[PDB]
Design a protein around this ligand. Structure first.
Ligand code: NA
Length: 163
């Protein structure tokens, strides 16, 4: 199994009763944990150590990655946007994976993944049916999120295991 560290999800910016970054961090973390392809470590990386992996052009010395050891790979997912507009709700995430083996830091995967769902597909009462509630996964946002989280982890698994 590839040994991975997940950074808190990055989101640069509210009518939602929960924090989108917190949902995305937990839901991706739960799926990397459940993956039998990936061993998800617990780390305590500082704000600045995590943040460097989200710089558009990263510059990360080996010294600046040691807080993520003993992971071999660092998963850095950024929410670029979640928006509405057959009006729909959509979200876009930039996924990066870095290889931090061998006292080096290299970005081995970068891709923008996205998902969209018709707002008519279910209820948009995100206070009655918000994240964690039973029926969130039946709302347009929850359906969209579920597919996106599944794709994010499938891609991470593929690129980690390829390497
Ligand atoms: Na796992």
């Amino acid at each position: 199994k590839g040994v991975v560290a997940m950074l808190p999800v990055f989101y640069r910016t509210e009518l939602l009763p929960w924090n989108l970054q917190a949902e995305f961090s937990e839901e991706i973390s739960r799926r990397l944990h459940s993956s039998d392809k990936l061993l998800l470590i617990k780390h305590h990386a500082s704000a600045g150590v995590a943040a460097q992996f989200f710089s558009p052009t990263p510059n990360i010395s080996p010294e600046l990655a040691t807080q993520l050891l003993p992971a071999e790979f660092v998963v850095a997912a950024e929410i670029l946007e979640q928006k509405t507009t057959n009006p729909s709700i959509s979200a876009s995430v930039r996924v990066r994976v870095f290889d931090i083996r061998h006292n080096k830091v290299s970005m081995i995967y970068q891709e923008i993944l996205d998902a969209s769902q018709s707002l008519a597909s279910g209820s948009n009462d995100y206070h009655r049916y918000g994240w964690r509630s039973k029926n969130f996964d039946s709302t347009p946002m929850g359906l969209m999120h579920q597919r996106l989280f599944r794709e994010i982890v499938a891609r991470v698994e593929g690129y980690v295991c390829a390497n």
